[PDB]
Amino acid sequence: AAKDVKFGNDARVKMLRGVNVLADAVKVTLGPKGRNVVLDKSFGAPTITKDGVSVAREIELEDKFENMGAQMVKEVASKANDAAGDGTTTATVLAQAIITEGLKAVAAGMNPMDLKRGIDKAVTAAVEELKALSVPCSDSKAIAQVGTISANSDETVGKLIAEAMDKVGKEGVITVEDGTGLQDELDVVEGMQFDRGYLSPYFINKPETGAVELESPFILLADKKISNIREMLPVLEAVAKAGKPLLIIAEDVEGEALATLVVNTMRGIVKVAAVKAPGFGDRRKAMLQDIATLTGGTVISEEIGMELEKATLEDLGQAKRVVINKDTTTIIDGVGEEAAIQGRVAQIRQQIEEATSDYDREKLQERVAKLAGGVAVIKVGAATEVEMKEKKARVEDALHATRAAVEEGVVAGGGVALIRVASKLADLRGQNEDQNVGIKVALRAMEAPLRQIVLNCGEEPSVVANTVKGGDGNYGYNAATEEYGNMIDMGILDPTKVTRSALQYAASVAGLMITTECMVTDLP
């Protein structure tokens, strides 16, 4: 296992080249007038896309060192995208700008740690100013406006998002399904979602969405860790002869069992998904029992006496539809007795009335809200199936954007919020010259994305950036109409969470990369 080691400036230069390649591939798509990029496929028909997430996913460098740098930048950008629902290309552009400026500063002879601390101070102040500039959208009218704007100025999508948001609640869960009719409708069904995802990425069967979807799947509920397969041969073969998919909810699935599941999924004879149980300790067991009473099944506990071998088909829980993502799952319209759910929620209410501490009180309140609020599913309608799928994807994107907005408000989009906060912080200073240099690096990097957008528009980035900086408030430059004005009023905005998350992960990866000292990677 011989490995190649690069020390000092060599590794940093290789990382700079890798991140430069990744950001040059991704940033061309930034902005409303984003350049097309061609991703060649093995089949023979290349796919032309204008979204940075796919370009980042396809990018992988031949050189090991540059590949490592691009991979870490892509990882932090994907973290930002998953946390916020958008902002891969913005985070990548910010990261590239900070890396370039910080590596130039390091080559001058300044302390990388002081530069990193200055960058962190600058981005913390920028986040504070951005939060100050955020415009809340708690009211339903602004929710509808944000939903409409996010869905490329479509009023029906915004109306659907607003109605569902009001129906389930501000923190509720909303799922999108294709409707059988032309008219679109929404309804509230029993279900819940939790903060656990799929154990193996190979379980995905919908590469376009990057999520696992099952139609009327059985649900297995066992708190015992599964490592042997012989314990689950009977239930697995019962599910197979039934023909329905299986969802495995357990404390942890690993060892030969996980390998058996993944190879069976690859062979496609039986579709099965394994999901780690939510929480830990007795709270995990309580959540598992809540899922069991929601889906009509029963948990399998080694302490009580029932075993996986003796578990039968009717013992497994049943749901109408489940969705598994990398971070969170979802159960939609899980079939279960109404009386059982009412009894369980009454028991949880009794427990919260008898709750002693405040932490367990909040935990029980969150659990009861999850159990009783349910999931609101929206059925999108269209004339044809192609329009149906397009509108479903558009509605999902609008839903993500609106959830981010209602979580953290909205700020002027098009990359002018970063310009505003940079102009505000122009007078910020640190406790050392190197920290001041890092702060200036961060401010210029925050200026960069608007420059990239306007360059994609073909105009001069410097003049437009200076004109935007001269203004105040939500005043900015629109890329589509090639003219200035208030970005919020004229329909260009993004949720504050997206910008904040992109800036924060860009700063974090920049701090990690600037202070990177050496590398360890395998020989070519």
Q: Does the annotation place 494 within a ligand binding site?
A: yes
Q: What DSSP designation does 413 have?
A: T
Q: Does the annotation place 32 within a ligand binding site?
A: yes
CATH 3.50.7.10 fits 191-371, yes or no: yes
Whether the CB-CB separation of 5 and 518 falls below 8 Å is answered with yes
Kindly state the tokens that stand for 404: 């981010």
CB atoms within 10 A of CB 382: 18
String of DSSP letters for 348-391:
HHHHHHT--SSHHHHHHHHHHHHHHH-EEEEEE--SSHHHHHHH
Q: Does the annotation place 86 within a ligand binding site?
A: yes
Name beta bridge partners: 330.
Answer: 323
Q: Which DSSP helix (H) or strand (E) runs through 486?
A: strand 483-486
Whether the CB-CB separation of 212 and 203 falls below 8 Å is answered with yes
Region of 501 (left: φ > 0; alpha: ψ -120 to 50; beta: rest) is alpha
Kindly state the tokens that stand for 233: 């041969």
Name beta bridge partners: 521.
Answer: 4
- For residues 66-96, one letter each, b for 16 or more C-beta atoms within 10 angstroms of the residue's C-beta and e for the rest, the string is bbbbbebbbebbbbbbbbbbbbbbbbbbbbb
Q: Does the annotation place 50 within a ligand binding site?
A: yes
> Which residue type sits at 467?
T
CB atoms within 10 A of CB 239: 22
Q: Does the annotation place 90 within a ligand binding site?
A: yes
Cα gap 282→351, rounded to integer Å? 14
| Positive/negative CA dihedral, 382, 387, 391, 393 | positive
Q: Does the annotation place 156 within a ligand binding site?
A: no
332: Cβ–Cβ under 8 A, 6 or more apart, which residues? Answer: 175, 177, 189, 191, 319, 320, 321, 322, 323, 375, 377
Q: Can you state the percent helix, strand and coil of the chain, rounding each to 5?
A: 50, 15, 35
Crossing angle of helices 433-456 and 496-514, in 10° steps, is: 130
Q: Does the annotation place 89 within a ligand binding site?
A: yes
3-class secondary structure per residue, 83-113: HHCCCHHHHHHHHHHHHHHHHHHHHHCCCHH
Q: Does the annotation place 414 within a ligand binding site?
A: yes
Q: Does the annotation place 276 within a ligand binding site?
A: no
> Which residue type sits at 444?
R
Q: Does the annotation place 105 within a ligand binding site?
A: no
CB atoms within 10 A of CB 218: 23
CATH 1.10.560.10 fits 1-134+410-524, yes or no: yes
Cα gap 292→284, rounded to integer Å? 12
Please give the distance of CA 182 from its chain centroid, rounded to a whole number. 31
Q: Does the annotation place 458 within a ligand binding site?
A: no
Phi then psi dihedrals of residue 287, to 5 deg = -65, -40
Beta strand segments in 284-346, E:
317-318, 321-324, 329-332
Q: Exposed, middle or buried, 427 (CB in 10 Å: 0-12/13-18/19+)? A: exposed
**How was this entry determined?**
cryo-EM
Q: Does the annotation place 30 within a ligand binding site?
A: yes
Q: Where are the domains of the chain?
A: 1-134+410-524, 135-190+372-409, 191-371
Length of the chain: 524
Please give the distance of CA 111 from its chain centroid, rounded to a whole number. 34
CATH 3.30.260.10 fits 135-190+372-409, yes or no: yes
Q: Does the annotation place 443 within a ligand binding site?
A: no
String of DSSP letters for 143-185:
HHHHHHHHTTS-HHHHHHHHHHHHHH-TT-EEEEEE-SSSS-E
Resolution (A): 3.2
Cα gap 80→92, rounded to integer Å? 10
Q: Which DSSP helix (H) or strand (E) runs through 212?
A: strand 212-215
Q: Which DSSP helix (H) or strand (E) runs through 485?
A: strand 483-486
Whether the CB-CB separation of 86 and 401 falls below 8 Å is answered with yes
Measure Cα distances from 394 to 144, 153, 229 in Å: 14, 11, 41
CA within 13 Å, CB half, 243? 0
Phi then psi dihedrals of residue 440, to 5 deg = -65, -40
Per the listing, tokens 């360890």 go with 520
